[PDB]
Amino acid sequence: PEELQKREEEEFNTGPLSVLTQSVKNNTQVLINCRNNKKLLGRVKAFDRHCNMVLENVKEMWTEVPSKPVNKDRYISKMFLRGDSVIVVLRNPLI
Amino acid sequence: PLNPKPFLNGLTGKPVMVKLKWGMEYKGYLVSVDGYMNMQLANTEEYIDGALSGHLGEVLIRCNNVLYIRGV
Amino acid sequence: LVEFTDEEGYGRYLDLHDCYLKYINLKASEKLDYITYLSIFDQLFDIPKERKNAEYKRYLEM
Amino acid sequence: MKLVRFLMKLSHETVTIELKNGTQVHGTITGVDVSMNTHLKAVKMTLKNREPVQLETLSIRGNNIRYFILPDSLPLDTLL
Amino acid sequence: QKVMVQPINLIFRYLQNRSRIQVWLYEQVNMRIEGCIIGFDEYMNLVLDDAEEIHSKTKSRKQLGRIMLKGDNITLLQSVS
Amino acid sequence: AHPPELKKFMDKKLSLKLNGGRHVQGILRGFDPFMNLVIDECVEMATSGQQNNIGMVVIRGNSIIMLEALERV
Amino acid sequence: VKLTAELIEQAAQYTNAVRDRELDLRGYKIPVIENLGATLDQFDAIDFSDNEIRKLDGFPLLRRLKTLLVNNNRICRIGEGLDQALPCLTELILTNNSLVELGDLDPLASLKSLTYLSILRNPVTNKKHYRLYVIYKVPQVRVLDFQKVKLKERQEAEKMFK
Amino acid sequence: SIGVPIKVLHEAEGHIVTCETNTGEVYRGKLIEAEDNMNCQMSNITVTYRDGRVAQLEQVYIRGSKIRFLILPDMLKNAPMLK
Amino acid sequence: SSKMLQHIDYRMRCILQDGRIFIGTFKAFDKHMNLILCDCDEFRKIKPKNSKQAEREEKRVLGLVLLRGENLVSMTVEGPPP
RNA sequence: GGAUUUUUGGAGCAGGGAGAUGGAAUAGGAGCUUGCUCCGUCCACUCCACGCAUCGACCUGGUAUUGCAGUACCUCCAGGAACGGUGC
Structure with missing residues (x-):
């Protein structure tokens, strides 16, 4: 409960998920890398242990072969993501 | 012997x-x-079949993708 | 039976949410909010709030 | 805390679920439990290369979902 | 009746030997992990040394050094040295 | 928290199908409640008929979705 | 007497003899072929044992149908739009029926899926070259009068009546 | 807690059942010993490996983790689980 | 909640790990939610491998099937309760 | 109660080559519509290496059995591959 959520903030902040912790305390738009090759770019609004992150200004792109694959691109602002389909959660993309 | 934690x-x-x-x-x-095996590197570049291609750097991976990890 | 949706009311409200979602997924604008939606969906032939020289015209047609 | 509890803030809520078998569906789900278990309703579903298939009472799984989209009139901080 | 010889007992005897073995993988039986394990834990997430990927069809070997392969993508191993 | 029932099958011959379509032909030798059935005198069987004797395979139930019997035990 | 979706929903839609979805409506003498699609895409057999249906007609769009019992009925003719409403159809068992003349075999041939058929106990039975007309008009058929079709029969049935 | 699924598996063990696994490994035979973790021991089974040469082996250890489904006694349709 | 507990006992199309639809008169749930589908069948795509050949589905029936928990992609109703 | 059996996922993807072989009416670009040239998505025929084997069901004719029991599926010879997934 109380001490557990204290250690939980310390874990999300000073552990591996520091990228999403900075996306949450810094309001960064971060690259959640899917294990299924669908690149969604956007913020991180709700984030926790299992890499479950809710992203704002979400834009999903895919390599869609109709040929030479095009970047299928759409932008649903608010949208949630569970951490199973995620391979990574990277704080900073160059765009 | 050099367990997961020390290695x-x-x-x-x-x-x-x-x-x-x-x-x-x-x-x-x-x-x-940590024990959750959630990886996260600082200034790491992407490779496909060992070819350095990307510049995202400090990126935090779920362990569910991890096949191998070695210190070059 | 199928001519009345949940809130539509058989002739009380209509389905603007679906075209709104299509326009959202098209334009992707961090301020494409109630005022912009209502202004684009009320007028007839103003200088439109999106490019009609793209598929926005076809989406309006749908 | 987890965002499973943030998705627990969804009932009478207009959502869009992109599930595990290349699925993308519009749905007002019926009720969601702690393990993401969110059963769809009046949902128009399309898996990979599919049609707008309709389910009036369907039960979309957990770890067999990929992405969730919440309402537009949904305050995020109030939902988590 | 008969007593259990743990897979952790196998991995422990292998590590104590500091022996070189090639290990199997998941959903791709073409590639084998040729190397030695350095240590272990209660989890059987295999840590490795001087390892290399060895392909059946391609016939190549790409070395890593002291690599830490996944624990769930292990199947078994053959002690080659 | 219950060990598996390989009890009369122990010290006997099984031909197992593990992931990668592979087969491990061997003796039931050791396990855990994790079902990690360990086969000594166990040999691999590939996609092609090629087979190599592996010495002592501790084959995790992480993949092996089948194994048949050579005898009655 | 009104044959309704009462008697079609209350009908039994469950495991048939050959382990398929059959929907029996035995014991009604139903002469009205209406309100049937409310089988709801979970049915392949429509059975009307003890019926007086003025002819063969009146079914809905069933792309799945796999058996139909129109025996012990009042079948006099054979209606037209049968195939697009039964493309999965092989079993349309209309024995103990009252088909008479080969003009009741006009829509019989347009199906690509007919192999298991029965029109037994009809005055189209003892007529000469009746099975010949059948083995001409039914290409993909395999079960005719509960004994296999023949390539010799097909030769006769194509070659004759030029 | 305890699963009426596991009660169904216990009513399906011991006799001829037909398990169906991940890559198509389907074994129709005496599913002798199944433990609630579903590592099903089958006996005198005919398993296809999806290969269409659905050959008969003896005393197979077909894990249930890959088990897509399991055709059980058609006589316990009136189970105590559902009733 | 136990959402399906109202929609059980009817012929319900349960979805697969590989994309089939299987209309079994579903019985019950679990914490793993492993399905016990009675009077249950299956049907999947008979892929033509081509376009001038069209796509169908060959009929398979297991009867009563104990679908292990790793199966469900969804559970919808395709038959009212008989 | 996201680590080797089920619900925080190994999921995604792509169909082997070619001939002055061909169809896109309403749908592709440039040569600034028509005509014509080349170009980045399939199928029908044919050449290879009917993409290669197994088996299963079936169509063909011949062929053994007259028999009572609750079914994965029960003849044998021979052709063809209309259909399924298993190894490359």
């Missing part, structure tokens, strides 16, 4: 090539990978 701790910060389950080999200094 991945002496390589957490050592520039690791970490192969993910789709060809992704990260080349960079890990931040921390």
